[PDB]
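[job 0412] stage=fold_complex status=start
inputs:
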Amino acid sequence: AKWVYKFEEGNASMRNLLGGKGCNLAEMTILGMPIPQGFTVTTEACTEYYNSGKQITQEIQDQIFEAITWLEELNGKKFGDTEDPLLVSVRSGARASMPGMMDTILNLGLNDVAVEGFAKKTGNPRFAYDSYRRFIQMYSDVVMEVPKSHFEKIIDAMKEEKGVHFDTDLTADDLKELAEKFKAVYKEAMNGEEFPQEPKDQLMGAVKAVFRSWDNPEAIVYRRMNDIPGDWGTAVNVQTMVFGNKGETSGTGVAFTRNPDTGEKGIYGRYLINAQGEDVVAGVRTPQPITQLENDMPDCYKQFMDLAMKLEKHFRDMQDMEFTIEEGKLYFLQTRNGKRTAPAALQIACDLVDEGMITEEEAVVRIEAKSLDQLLHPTFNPAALKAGEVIGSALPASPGAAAGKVYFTADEAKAAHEKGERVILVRLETSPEDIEGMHAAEGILTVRGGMTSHAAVVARGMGTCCVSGCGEIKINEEAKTFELGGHTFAEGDYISLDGSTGKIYKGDIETQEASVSGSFERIMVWADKFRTLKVRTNADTPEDTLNAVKLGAEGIGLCRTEHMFFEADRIMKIRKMILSDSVEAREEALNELIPFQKGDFKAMYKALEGRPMTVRYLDPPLHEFVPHTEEEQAELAKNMGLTLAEVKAKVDELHEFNPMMGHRGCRLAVTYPEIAKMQTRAVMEAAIEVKEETGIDIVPEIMIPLVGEKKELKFVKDVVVEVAEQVKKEKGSDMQYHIGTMIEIPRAALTADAIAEEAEFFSFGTNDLTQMTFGFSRDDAGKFLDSYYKAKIYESDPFARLDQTGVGQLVEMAVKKGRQTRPGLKCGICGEHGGDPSSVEFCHKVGLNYVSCSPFRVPIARLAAAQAALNN
Amino acid sequence: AKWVYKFEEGNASMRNLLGGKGCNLAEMTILGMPIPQGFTVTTEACTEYYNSGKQITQEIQDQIFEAITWLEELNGKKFGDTEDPLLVSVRSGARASMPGMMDTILNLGLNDVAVEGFAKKTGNPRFAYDSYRRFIQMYSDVVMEVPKSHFEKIIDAMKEEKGVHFDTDLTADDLKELAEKFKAVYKEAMNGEEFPQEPKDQLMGAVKAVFRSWDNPEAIVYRRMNDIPGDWGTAVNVQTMVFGNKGETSGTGVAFTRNPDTGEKGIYGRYLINAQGEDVVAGVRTPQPITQLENDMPDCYKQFMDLAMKLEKHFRDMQDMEFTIEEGKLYFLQTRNGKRTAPAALQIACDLVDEGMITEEEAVVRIEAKSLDQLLHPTFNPAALKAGEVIGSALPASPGAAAGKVYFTADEAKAAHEKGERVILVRLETSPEDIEGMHAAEGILTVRGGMTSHAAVVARGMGTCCVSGCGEIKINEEAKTFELGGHTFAEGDYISLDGSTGKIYKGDIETQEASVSGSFERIMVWADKFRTLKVRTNADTPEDTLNAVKLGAEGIGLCRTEHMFFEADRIMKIRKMILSDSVEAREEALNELIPFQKGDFKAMYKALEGRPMTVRYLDPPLHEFVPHTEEEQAELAKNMGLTLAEVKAKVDELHEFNPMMGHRGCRLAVTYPEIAKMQTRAVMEAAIEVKEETGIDIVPEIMIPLVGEKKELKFVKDVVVEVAEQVKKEKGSDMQYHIGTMIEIPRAALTADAIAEEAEFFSFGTNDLTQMTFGFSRDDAGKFLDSYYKAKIYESDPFARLDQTGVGQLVEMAVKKGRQTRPGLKCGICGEHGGDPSSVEFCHKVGLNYVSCSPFRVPIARLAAAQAALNN
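[job 0412] stage=fold_complex status=done
writing structure:
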């Protein structure tokens, strides 16, 4: 039949026959790109070899030799002649790019006479014999099976013998010698057969090898069995070699169709005369800007320019191209969508849309959503970062570049910042009492605490850098000094944090500011046009809200209420409630917080101006609101007229073997309804009042945490409804409200249909859901997850990336089941995964109404959502 | 149409029309039982009333009056005549027995003249006017709506006025008075209408009321909407009244067809002449044995005897009957399957099979499986238990009656038991070091620890009583004394425990011994014939095994391995391993346990004699194997040449926020494979050797705890297989083995299909599964579960009874999915639920291969299984 196709005789649709490489080479040849000319041995020729019992059909060989003759005629010179020798590259390629890799052999055709003609033409004998000796080795390794060892020993001998120190320091005369030693090895392995001197023996050997290598053990067997059986094989691509060091009319270069750092249209790049690509990357000789090529060789410049524009137009996006000029003849070695940055991605996309080269849809889909984080947090010279001294590392709690003078107390950091200094707050951990200092800091570094720690969460809300859980640190509070890595640091000593990698740097050089871009804003709008998912945010204060809404947030998916009991002015009321011994004494202590909490609630609604807000009732156990220090325990006993013991008895009574699965959330409302009632009163009055005050309508959303059973929710629901309806009566209002639940307990997802019968909405708390589905606590998972990631047990952080295969099932289910009893059931996600692109896309596909993420990730979600809608 | 049926004109198949009561009355009338004669107003008559706008059709009324005339003719006396007045009972009954109850009115037909004839006939005027005044009240309450209050005030007045103290102390002359006061109240509520003096007005009133009461709010609306709509209603049953206090030829009695305490065939019971049932129960007059009735009234005795046997034969089981003789005329008021005990249940069932009255299948199904626990643990006079002084209560860890002298140390209890004393071990908690004392104790009482505590588990294995988690106790170790409830108790002071209720009793009177019964053994065999589920047991030592197998266990579903590291002679090796800082130093420390553990394993296989055993690898975190006391921490530092600090740094390093979801189980093998290898070595050599030693074949089963992901298991599986196959080589054996996993992590159940690809069997660890599905820790659940049970949130302990609706789903799923990849996949259950009848039945239905429970529950499972097979 026909087992050999020239690149001009194929296209992308003959992928099956020519392999993925072969067809792509053909494609680019049709595009008028002067690729080094060649042909392809078909994947059917790989099938015929195996059906001939490891003996290539004379037919095939002949058609290979025929195509070889064709190449020679084009190139004007034979295969290994003495004047201008033809050399080729053999590359293997299947229908698919796949796990378990393919082979590449360069300089095929070299021999004892071709090596000389090559040295004459290049004017560099050292370069000629260097290539020969490499070819000899690579051929012997791939074609036959002579180990590198035999060759590596001899190179180590000669280098060591001549007192030289590296793979390079060899003279032309030494490579000549080494090449003969190498040939001797092949002969000393092939029962006295000389190194494939025959250019044709070389070719075939390489063609045989390629087909042969498809039948080897592991990678191979897996790919055939699982993927798709039938008649798969592998193609062999044979291509002419190029050179840009043959003289003053010869060169090599690399250029971009557009500027990869800024995104400005127009050729950008470099090149060198009489050199190979290596020499360009090496910069020993100052590479000359691409545009100067018009001065040296206008003819080639012109051709170059045209084809570049043709490439850009065909691929429809900024191309990164490698080129080589051989004795006034232009060749193109490689082309690919060039690399760039977030600001650049946007800018180019926009341009591309305005130039009419791409659609808006396409612009949106092609931008890497995770990159957008770059636009929001400052960055100092990437050279200065690599030039920076790493003294440790930890968890990247909140992204950003932070740099400033270190201080060890919230007040000293604030006071220092107020004097005009860049401040870095270093503590064991933070608390709500240190909030004022946190805000004034450029960053925050903690000794203990994970992603969910007090420092990590508050810092994401404030859009402030945060590196947490750095155990290597050793703070000396009294001295105001801390040890890490190479030395101790005192108050005022500058440091640098990388909130994106978790890296901590010794020194003082501030980053820049957070840049904006219309292109950003333009993309957002396009994103909006396409997305279906509304995006809400997780916010606990007005500031955070405002920033979130500034970045497109449509409301609050999760409003935590813990702080409203934690703060200095509140904690006394909760504490008192905790240590009381009467339902009446509890209710009284709790009423004393209403004003303070209602006042918090007002402010939120003020800031949301009609946007919805999901409020999560009290989620953690009472254990956390009681003092853990004999000092505070004493202070409190003093304040309520109790003994230090009696308080201590209460504290230990509250002690729980596994606080993650104790008396908390819904289970706490069940025992002490008084808590819920109070939170309901505060919320409901807060809304009603702001409604009257502005006429802005409000629909409060009340969310019950840690629900696992229908009747459970119903107990609590009843309480809240009775109270809400009371507050309505008292202020004569008709305000609508909704009660829903968190789905963070596997059971709740399994019986979602029953749960829905009461719950008006479902919020997936995928944090606590993941914990329980996998059966581990985030805070204790560090001490093996690392070992798991190494061992490839897990390829992704399940707390950072939603686990679709396992956790996903429950979510999907929960939704499907919820809508069976309540068709118009709204479902969102409020975990950290809500700002994870792949997670969002899942959420889209399974049918959620919205996602919720930290304020400064809203943009990534917004985009992510739009992509998911377009991908499905 | 026809709206009134006499009892002789119905049967069980006309349930729809006559209601459940009406049809059952008819049935028993066909059985030749001289029931007080009557009729039934149909449920269609309830429909016609509602379709007539609350006005009874003359048709219906007439057919009621017609049936009334019929009753009168039978009874020979009119409705409220002056000589021998006819009185009736009105009872309402629907097609179904249901939630939300029906009404009963007695003595219908009483009035100002009938009350006199009644007092004359009975010879007891106080009894006559007492009934009148009650009727007057009950009628006014039910028929009209006069509250009890109006009547209760007047009774309280007269009682208080006459200086009497109770509802009884009234004279005939005072009841006469009170009846007139009562009539005045009705007249003073019914706009001057006299108390329904007319016997017919009374009847109708009661008939109207019944139909009326079907339309009331809650219970009613729920039952109609959900259950089954169409044309439901309620029937009215009207029945003649009886009396056994009319004279010396009149009486009342209660008898059993067989002895309810021992199960011996033959009439058993009591009776009284000239009395009502009350008087029998009262025992003021010494009731005369039933068999003496033949002396008083032979004619009635004879009739009685026949009908009793007829009843027994019809219902096909020991009947408990109430009877009344009125002036030489025998009537039967009630019959039901009499009550009995476990030993009695068996004995009667067996008898019933031998007498040919029931099939074997039927015998099996009718025995209450949970009762069987009575046969295994001794019990002292139930009077003495109620006569016993309760000083506290706690959790019923291990059932039994324990009574003995208290001791506070394992050694003192043993030493005391060795001298011949009944011992009761009271500690804060137990440990493996106290095992010798535990065995020697009649019971065990602990201050802390739940059902899964060290005392609860070891005591179930040993079949020893155990009441755990009694926080009220205050042990004084040095003094050897402890406070609870009313007083402090010293060493030697006797106490009593109830391992079935958790009750603790002050005193010294031992129970009896554990009785056996062929009937037991006979039932087991019948059970075997029917069950499909094999039953295995959870056992950690040979003794336990032996007892389990003695009670029918077919092998070990779960063999815990924790103790093999915990014990005094082992703990040093684990400790050393823990504090090591080298893979090599870990491996060496672990090898030192092989002999001790292999030696444990040998003994098990010795005891199992070919029966299979599932071995669970190390499940708890390393934190538990390290010393928690500065003393021991110091001792260990001394033993390994470390500082007290350095040990303390290691201990705190291992500290975990939530130990239930930390670095343990599979996750521990992942990091420290060395542990698994060692456990595999020990197991594999242990099996091989015993195999050679006896020729008894063995198939070791190796079970990995806390698996959540396919590749996770595979990592560990590889390790174990490499090692097992080594040990095989080393001893030149061809012994088969299987590796499976525990399914206690929700995820594992969700991806069971993937997990199965490696796991050769699945064991449901429904303990840890429930914890995680519900999202709570058993140990912390006490402080609200109580509140949940009260509030009817949960009607069952999910740790004691499998939660089919929620947890069940995962199990079911796990099985279905596992068998998709591995059809011949064996699945068992090893949690506490394995000995819970309803759980077993689930396990049966979803397809498990076997169940596993604590040795002394094997019998309940065996039975339970047989029932499930017959029920499905």
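[job 0412] summary: Residues 109-195 of chain A form a domain with the Acyl-CoA Binding Protein fold (CATH 1.20.80.30).
[job 0412] exit 0
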